[PDB]
């Protein structure tokens, strides 16, 4: 969906976000993805 966040979701339960800003993965969703 974003350019910057990887949307990285199963049903497995999967909240995941890679993003090569420092390479930080958001488990908790950021303000700059929905």
């Known amino acids: 969906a974003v350019s910057?966040?990887?949307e990285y979701k199963?049903?497995?339960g999967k909240t995941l976000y890679?993003?090569?800003r420092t390479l930080e993965?958001?488990?908790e969703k950021p303000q700059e993805l929905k």
Do not use: I, L, P, R
């Open 25 to 27: 993965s958001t488990w």
């Open 4 to 6: 910057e966040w990887t």
């Open 18 to 20: 890679y993003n090569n």
């Open 10 to 12: 199963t049903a497995d």
